[PDB]
């Protein structure tokens, strides 16, 4: 009773929450979509065979930002991007980028802007990335 024998997801007016969980098995992590980015809708015949490029193309065509932290894929809309400026007292930026490289939380799409061996820099991105980098850079100065 089911149609043509290819592979794909047919979307008849879904609402971006029931759509990305269908991609949540080809991506091997669960997907968490925010409330402001769950009001848009999509309709069409889609086909997932490599989803990390499909999410990159749809995040630019629909207008979205996303972050994969190793255990889930958070998805926000572009009007939720926050930024902050934080100054480090007792540790440098390269000794903080080695913590991000060794921990696997480093993201090349939203890097850290600042002088290479100083205390002040500039972050911007999704709120789960900014709330992680601010608190993980403040809690290292109270160690040192």
């Amino acid at each position: 009773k089911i149609p043509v024998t290819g592979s794909g997801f047919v979307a008849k007016d879904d609402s971006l929450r029931t759509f990305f969980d269908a991609m949540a098995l080809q991506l091997k992590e669960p997907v968490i979509v925010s409330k402001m980015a769950a009001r848009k809708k999509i309709t069409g015949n889609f086909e997932f065979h490599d989803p990390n490029a499909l999410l990159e193309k749809l995040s630019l065509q629909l207008g979205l930002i996303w972050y994969f932290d190793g255990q889930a894929i958070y998805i926000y809309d572009a009007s939720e991007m926050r930024n902050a400026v934080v100054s480090l007292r007792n540790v440098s930026l390269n000794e903080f980028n080695n913590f991000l490289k060794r921990s696997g939380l480093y993201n090349k799409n939203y890097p850290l802007r600042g002088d290479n061996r100083k205390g002040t820099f500039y972050v911007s991105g999704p709120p789960v990335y900014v709330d992680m980098v601010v608190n993980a850079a403040t809690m290292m100065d109270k160690q040192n």
Binding site: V4, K12, D13, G44, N45, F46, F48, A53, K57
Partner: peptide
Amino acid sequence: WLKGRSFQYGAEGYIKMSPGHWYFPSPL
């Protein structure tokens, strides 16, 4: 509104599907 032909969209552009029995009911 697409008289006969049907496509699917993923990760590279469009792919021409094989002719089959079921059609997508088109909303306009």
